Design a binder for this molecule. Structure first.
Ligand code: SF4
Ligand code: SF4
Ligand code: SF4
Ligand code: FES
Ligand SMILES: [Zn+2]
Lengths: 692, 47, 80, 155, 68, 117, 123, 57
């Protein structure tokens, strides 16, 4: 079923029917290109992958020539070496003289490409000159100078097929061809900024990071995205103090070399509103103070209030470290109170399902299994919003194979074709027994997918009890080699927190605390906090969580520390620190160590490796990094998820409203960054953001 | 000053050193290149 | 107070513990509704129970042990 | 460098003394002036840099006019020009002596290594084989005719 | 030294034949602003002082409390 | 004029030097660092020193705004900024400007704005 | 350059651990004999037995190396530093590298616990 | 000898931050940060030569 051929003497075998350029990549003979891409449709617009083929009258493009057996591929024919210089020279007679103002200085693929294979001179010295192109306003996210564009089609095929915003397009013939809406209307898909990593010239580039640095100055650091349930494998570009930008480093499973929009532009809030020193409340006024004085005030007011048990509330947030929450849980339960609750509304109890049986809070199919998916249904979520990388996988599957999606709850605009069913758990229960009890029994590799917003609803448990019956009832959705129950989170950390055992007891859910511990956790209200409560915030920037506080503690953000994160898939991933904590911020668990020391609590560690062993004690799957194991406990896990909230939850007719208010305003950084404020204003039902 | 002599203290810079070889192509863009081996001293082909 | 234990998802030397959590959780959770269990696995471990008490102080035992009731002997020993 | 194409006598001493090492230096003025006489008469016309724009800069006349000259002008001043791997030892006749250089190319654009053979390095190294027995004012006339400028020897 | 005008300072060190009183006005660089001629003030309290032109990299957070 | 020297003490420089420029008082960059921040940073090495004989270098954003916006008969303009007296290659390189949109268009090197008419 | 300097030896590599041990023992005797010369020559502030108790503890640092030839490079470096100190070749600024701890008692708040590391985020 | 930044006719700063001067100053005397200003054109925020180490290449 495979084909062996010869590229430059190198024999190489590749699967039949594939493209020749992948065979050149497999053989190790580097062939330059401009408009081939792996994850995209193939168009031969670039003319760069010209290559000599025995039994061919003319040299042909290697991107779209299909693999045939008995093939002799030559790349160094003098005709081909002529041809590459030719095509480069043809490309470089309307591209404008913008190399010192173009953003991709060292990263111009065209440019490095034109050093190997370019001509010495360029005989453009015509009088009346090149063409020139309109400014083409698009949005506040994507800087646009269409003069530098070469119509390499790589933007528009992506936003067409995978991003699913078909507003981009090619309009006009010859040099009157342009790219984009000639309405001059606003583009938005929920992964909008992914085109500026994709246009190989600086036609489309980064608007907030417009000219601030330049890719030879940069220090690069491979790390993990947060404020996203997938925890995409990213790269931090940093000058050394600030954080310049983020670019998705390639990874096969988790992101297929794509990244969320909010994940992209989040570096603005990472440098503008940060906590740089500890501030103690005077009474309607904070003053900054000695780093001893803050923690000594913590110990002093602990001796004043004395929470002896079930009065030390400890709440963590959305982008918080697993390694920090270990220190948190250790401190609280050596303190003698498991008032250990999430930030979410209806987080003050257990989240209506098992903290046991990791399957209860994880994504049990593979994300790679979504290529093999058949017919699924969302409940109570917008997966276009929550984990837009997942939506990219959904649309790629739906275009590739033949699928069926249902959507129960909020009416969303997908890129793909949804099928709505209702806005009631009774409408849901009607739909399960209506027609898809037959379909999901029929389907080979389906799944069923649940957003985390239903955890907000107090009627979650019966909301589980229906669906927990159905997985139990249908053996097709619950077989050995995968499990159809699949849940997501809004964070990169509440999955890791549910690995920690970050849940209050039924007893701990009752008492109003006296000493509230904020660790991130922006979305608390004045209702969630007691009146006289000791409310020491530990975070990185200034949000609502820092506004209620008594003492704030500058902790490092996700960039500055050696983080450890768990996605909804369950991948334990290292976040390599790109820079040091700025000002007077420190790392979080190191702060909790000293906070223990000014109490009677003795944490048994002082290093990072001893934390790694303590973390191995909580779960050894979190020191064994980034390797996804399945669960051998499917049926017992679903049954134990059924038995707990069985019956006692009485589901009301509350409509399944939207989980989040806006996408680009959450998680204390989209509110910190001014670029997401101006992103938020431009993105609701505007005449440039409307369709018709 | 106080030891009235020079002392050897560990390194502190005003400006951190910045190389710029991080911007670098992996494959060396020079080609394979022809040979100048003598026709005596390369291996004769069989037949 | 809490308790956890860890298996390896390969079927070797955690299989009596594996069937122990296949069966005995519906009785053990009802036997101790105050404290809390949780299960995790890491592709090869030694099967091991870690429990935390009413101090934050914890205790441990390693479960190279024969059957489900032989697990339960060590578990009941480890609670007290 | 067309020292072939320029007629040039060379002086050669007789004893091993410092006086031949003096007289040869006096002679090389007379020789290197004759160089200038045969150079200024026969300076040709032609391109003063190398012909291509791929190892040095294009002239600034046409880089503001041509698209191709900019990318060379940029890559030569950000990356630089790429060198084939290998190693060379090129040594030429400095007026101090044979000055050599041994460069080891990565194939990158930084030299992976580059030794100098400063000429006065071995001259200083050959001091106490020559300087034995002589006097201390005689230990000054030996110094500046092996030409220890000391910018050379250490580096 | 450096109490002389630049377009003369060239000619004092023999840069030009034609001193700037005799140059054509086409070679005068046209300027849209007046000229001041600070010669040098080294050691004088009019000495140049340096500073970084830009602000600190990361702005702090202003304390805004919230009475619950 | 009087700005707080981190201690409640005020430092007092004349309004001729609370200026970004002799042409402009206001900042023009996101990280411009106004002089009111700068004397607030290090007046330590500014005492006993003259205020007059520092640069004040006549910032460009005022000077470019009063240049006349040129007109172009056809469609595509060309900008060089090069003199026609100087025997050489000066000015910014020969980039072209599309002027079609309503409003002028600055040549991104020289800042001269062109208009199609 | 036929001839060497006064104390310089031709470097030669002992085939056995015992012959290396013999050379190191003779070497420590050479340091210990030349130690009162050093306080005169480098004009140092302090006393001769402080020099001797450093020269002892520096060999105590490398008492527990297994290999023959790593002790061979170690012996050669020791012999070269002997060669430097026996002449005027080091100067007293470079000679007082070997006592950072003696000349100044360190200063206030030498960090010992976690907390003193933490309050200056490990210095 | 010493340095200066030219300006355009009708007085505009003439320096864009191409960073070539940062890229090939072999003593790294050049240090530049630069931001997009109000009108949108690129200009240099801080341009700084360390004239201790300007080697007159
Ligand atoms: S994309 Fe920009 S930087 Fe690259 S060659 Fe073109 S103008 Fe120059
Ligand atoms: S918009 Fe950019 S990526 Fe798309 S074809 Fe044009 S230049 Fe290429
Ligand atoms: S910043 Fe760039 S354009 Fe400006 S002077 Fe320096 S090298 Fe030239
Ligand atoms: S990708 Fe092969 S021709 Fe465009
Ligand atoms: Zn211009």
């Amino acid at each position: 079923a495979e084909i062996e051929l010869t590229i430059d003497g190198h024999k190489v075998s590749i699967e039949a029917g594939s493209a020749l350029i992948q065979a050149c990549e497999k053989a190790g003979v580097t062939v330059p290109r401009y408009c081939y891409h792996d994850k995209l449709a193939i168009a031969g617009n670039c003319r760069m992958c010209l290559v000599d083929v025995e039994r061919a009258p003319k040299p042909v493009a290697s991107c779209a020539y299909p693999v045939a057996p008995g093939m002799v591929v030559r790349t160094d024919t003098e005709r081909v070496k002529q041809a590459r210089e030719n095509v480069m020279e043809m490309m470089l007679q309307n591209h404008p003289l913008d190399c010192p103002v173009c953003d991709q200085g060292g990263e111009c693929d065209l440019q490095d490409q034109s050093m190997r294979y370019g001509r010495d001179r360029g005989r453009f010295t015509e009088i009346t000159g090149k063409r020139s192109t309109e400014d083409k306003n698009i949005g506040p996210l994507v800087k646009t100078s269409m003069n530098r564009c070469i119509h390499c089609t790589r933007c528009v095929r992506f936003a067409n097929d995978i991003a699913g915003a078909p507003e981009l397009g090619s309009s006009g013939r010859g040099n009157d061809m342009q790219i984009g809406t000639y309405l001059e209307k606003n583009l938005n898909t929920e992964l909008s900024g992914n085109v500026i990593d994709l246009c190989p010239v600086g036609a489309l580039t980064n608007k907030p990071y417009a000219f601030r640095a330049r890719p030879w100055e940069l220090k690069k650091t491979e790390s993990i995205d947060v404020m996203d349930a997938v925890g995409s494998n990213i790269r931090i570009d940093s000058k050394g103090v600030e954080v310049m930008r983020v670019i998705p480093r390639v990874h096969e499973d988790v992101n297929e070399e794509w990244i969320n929009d909010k994940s992209r532009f989040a570096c603005d809030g990472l440098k503008t509103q940060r906590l740089t020193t500890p501030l103690i409340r005077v009474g309607d006024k904070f003053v900054n103070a000695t780093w001893d004085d803050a923690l000594s005030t913590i110990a002093k007011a602990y001796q004043q209030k004395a929470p002896k048990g079930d009065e030390f509330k400890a709440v963590a947030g959305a982008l918080v470290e697993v390694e920090s929450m270990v220190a948190l849980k250790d401190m609280t339960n050596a303190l003698g109170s498991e008032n250990t609750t999430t930030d979410t509304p209806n987080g003050n109890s257990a989240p209506a399902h098992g903290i046991t049986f990791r399957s209860n809070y994880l994504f049990n199919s593979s994300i790679a299994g979504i290529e093999d998916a058949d017919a699924i249904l969302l409940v109570g979520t917008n997966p276009r919003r929550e984990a837009a990388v997942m939506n990219a996988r959904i649309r790629k599957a739906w275009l590739r194979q033949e699928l069926e999606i249902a959507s129960v709850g909020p009416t969303l605009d997908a890129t793909f074709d949804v099928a709505e069913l209702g806005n009631t758990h009774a409408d849901l229960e009607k739909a399960l027994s209506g027609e898809f009890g037959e379909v999901l029994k029929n389907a080979k590799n389906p799944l069923i997918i649940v957003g985390s917003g239903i955890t907000d609803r107090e009627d979650a448990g019966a909301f589980f009890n229906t669906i927990g019956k159905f997985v139990e009832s249908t053996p097709s959705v619950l077989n050995e080699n995968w499990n159809g129950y699949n849940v997501l989170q809004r964070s990169a950390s509440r999955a890791g927190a549910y690995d920690i055992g970050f849940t209050p007891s039924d007893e701990a859910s009752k008492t109003t605390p006296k000493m509230v511990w904020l660790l991130g956790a922006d979305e608390v209200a004045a209702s969630d906090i007691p009146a006289d409560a000791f409310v020491v915030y530990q975070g990185h920037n200034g949000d609502v969580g820092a506004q209620f506080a008594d003492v704030v503690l500058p902790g490092a953000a996700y960039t500055e520390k050696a983080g450890t994160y768990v996605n909804t898939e369950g991948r334990s991933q290292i976040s390599r620190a790109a820079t040091g904590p700025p000002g007077g911020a420190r790392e979080d668990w190191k702060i909790l160590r000293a906070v223990s020391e000014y109490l009677g609590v003795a944490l048994p560690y002082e290093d990072a490796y001893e934390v790694r062993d303590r973390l191995a004690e909580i779960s050894p799957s979190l020191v064994r990094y980034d390797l996804v194991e399945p669960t051998v406990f499917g049926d017992v896990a679903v049954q134990h998820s059924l038995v707990g909230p069985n019956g006692s939850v009485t589901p009301s007719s509350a409509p399944l409203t939207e989980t989040i208010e806006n996408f680009y305003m959450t998680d204390s950084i989209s509110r910190s960054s001014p670029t997401m404020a101006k992103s938020s204003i431009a993105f609701n039902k505007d005449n440039k953001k409307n369709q018709a | 000053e106080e030891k009235r002599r020079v002392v050897y203290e560990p390194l502190e810079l005003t400006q951190a050193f910045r190389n710029f070889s991080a911007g670098s192509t992996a494959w060396e863009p020079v080609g394979p290149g022809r040979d100048d081996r003598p026709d005596s001293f390369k291996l004769p082909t069989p037949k | 107070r809490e308790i956890r234990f860890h298996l390896c998802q390969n079927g070797s030397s955690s299989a009596p513990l594996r069937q122990f959590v296949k069966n005995q959780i519906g009785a053990f959770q009802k036997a101790n509704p105050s404290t809390k269990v949780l299960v995790r696995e890491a592709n090869g471990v030694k099967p091991i129970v870690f429990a935390r008490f009413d101090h934050g102080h914890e205790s441990k035992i390693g479960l190279d042990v024969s059957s489900e009731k032989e697990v339960a002997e060590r578990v009941k020993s480890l609670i007290e | 460098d067309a020292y072939d194409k320029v007629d040039f006598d060379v002086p050669v001493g007789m004893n091993g003394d410092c006086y031949d090492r003096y007289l040869i230096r006096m002679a090389e003025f007379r020789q290197s002036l004759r160089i200038i006489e045969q150079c200024c008469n026969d300076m040709p016309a032609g391109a003063v840099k190398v012909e291509d724009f791929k190892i040095n800069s294009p002239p600034r006349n046409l880089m503001k006019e041509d698209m191709e000259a900019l990318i060379h002008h940029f890559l030569l001043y950000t990356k630089g020009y790429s060198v084939p791997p290998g190693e060379t030892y090129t040594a030429i006749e400095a007026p101090k002596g044979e000055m050599g250089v041994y460069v080891v190319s990565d194939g990158s654009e930084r030299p992976y290594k580059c030794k100098i053979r400063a000429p006065g390095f071995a001259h200083l190294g050959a001091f106490d084989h020559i300087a034995r027995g002589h006097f201390l004012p005689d230990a000054v006339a030996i110094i500046g005719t092996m030409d220890l400028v000391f910018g050379e020897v250490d580096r | 030294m450096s109490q002389v005008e630049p377009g003369w300072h060239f000619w004092l060190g023999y840069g030009v034949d034609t001193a700037p009183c005799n140059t054509p006005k086409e070679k005068l660089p046209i300027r849209a602003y007046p000229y001041k001629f600070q010669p040098n003030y080294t050691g004088t309290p009019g000495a140049f002082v340096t500073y970084n032109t830009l602000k600190p990299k990361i702005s702090a957070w202003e304390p805004v409390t919230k009475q619950r | 004029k009087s700005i707080i020297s981190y201690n409640g003490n005020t430092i007092e420089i004349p309004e001729e030097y609370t200026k970004q420029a002799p042409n402009r008082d206001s900042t023009w960059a996101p990280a411009q660092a106004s002089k009111t921040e700068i004397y607030k940073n290090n007046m330590v090495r500014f005492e006993q020193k003259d205020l007059s004989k520092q640069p004040m270098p006549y910032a460009g954003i005022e000077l470019i705004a009063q240049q006349p916006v040129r007109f172009v008969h056809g469609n595509t303009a060309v900008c060089d900024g090069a003199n026609h007296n100087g025997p050489g290659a000066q000015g910014h390189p020969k980039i072209f400007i599309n002027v079609d949109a309503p409003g002028s268009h600055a040549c991104q090197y020289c800042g001269t704005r062109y208009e199609k008419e | 350059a036929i001839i060497a300097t006064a104390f310089a030896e031709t470097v030669k590599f002992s085939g056995s651990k015992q012959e290396l041990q013999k050379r190191t023992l003779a070497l420590y005797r050479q340091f210990l004999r030349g130690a009162p010369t050093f306080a005169d020559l480098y004009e140092v502030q302090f006393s001769i037995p402080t020099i001797r108790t450093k020269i002892r503890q520096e060999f105590e640092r490398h008492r527990f190396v297994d290999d023959l030839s790593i002790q061979n490079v170690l012996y050669a470096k020791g012999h070269m530093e002997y060669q430097e100190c026996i002449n005027f070749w080091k100067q007293q600024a470079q000679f007082l590298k070997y006592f950072p701890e003696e000349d100044d008692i360190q200063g206030r708040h030498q960090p010992s616990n976690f907390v003193d590391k933490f309050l200056k985020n490990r210095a | 000898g010493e340095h200066a930044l030219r300006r355009y006719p009708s007085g505009e700063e003439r320096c864009i931050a191409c960073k070539l001067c940062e890229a090939i100053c072999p003593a790294l005397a050049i240090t530049i940060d630069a931001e997009e200003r109000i009108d949108g054109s690129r200009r240099t925020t801080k341009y700084d030569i360390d004239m201790t180490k300007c080697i007159y290449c």
